[PDB]
């Protein structure tokens, strides 16, 4: 229940993704858990909201993260790769141009179990999650943010 970035593990054990605990809600990408319940110590976390199109899910409450890329500044990916200590990778996002508007995108390619890692602005706020994207062959991840 403590605020922070978390590995999402499965049972040997394997890391299938990452997520963000904030304000009592756990935030990750739908494709990481498919909405399965999550064990945290002796407690259980149940899905509360989810959306396949956004590729997002929240547990224990509504999606809490609402900061957004400012379109000009560098950001940091707080990557939590399997088997590796949490690490910050700073980058200038590029852009996904869509019919519905523009979305920040980071041209960073980490192992699949890093999906759900938070992307941060300079003030430390989570402006979205890593791991839904496209290939150009380099992967590029949308900065995927929900609605509060």
């Amino acid at each position: 229940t403590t605020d922070g970035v978390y590995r999402v593990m499965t049972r040997g054990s394997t890391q299938v993704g990452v997520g963000v605990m904030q304000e009592g809600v756990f935030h990750t990408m739908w494709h990481v858990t498919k909405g399965a319940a999550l064990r945290s110590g002796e407690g259980r976390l149940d899905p509360y909201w989810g959306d396949v199109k956004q590729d997002l899910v929240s547990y224990c409450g509504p999606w809490k993260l609402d900061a957004a890329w400012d379109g000009l500044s560098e950001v940091q990916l707080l990557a939590v790769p399997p088997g590796e200590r949490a690490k910050n990778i700073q980058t200038l996002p590029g852009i996904f141009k869509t019919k519905d508007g523009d979305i920040g995108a980071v041209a960073l390619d980490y192992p699949a179990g890093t999906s759900g890692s938070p992307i941060l602005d300079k003030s430390g706020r989570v402006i979205g999650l890593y791991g839904n994207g496209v290939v150009i062959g380099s992967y590029v991840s949308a900065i995927t943010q929900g609605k509060r």
Partner: protein
């Protein structure tokens, strides 16, 4: 299948982080299944 979580750190900006990666501008479309694909 037992899915579980382990704390891996605080959410903070680090001043001494590695800097890398490009900033491509891409036309994409997002479908009902949440899949991005390129568009021309």
């Amino acid at each position: 299948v037992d899915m579980y979580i382990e704390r891996a750190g605080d959410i903070t900006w680090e001043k001494d982080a590695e800097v890398t990666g490009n900033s491509p501008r891409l036309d994409v479309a997002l479908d009902e299944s949440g899949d991005f694909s390129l568009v021309e």
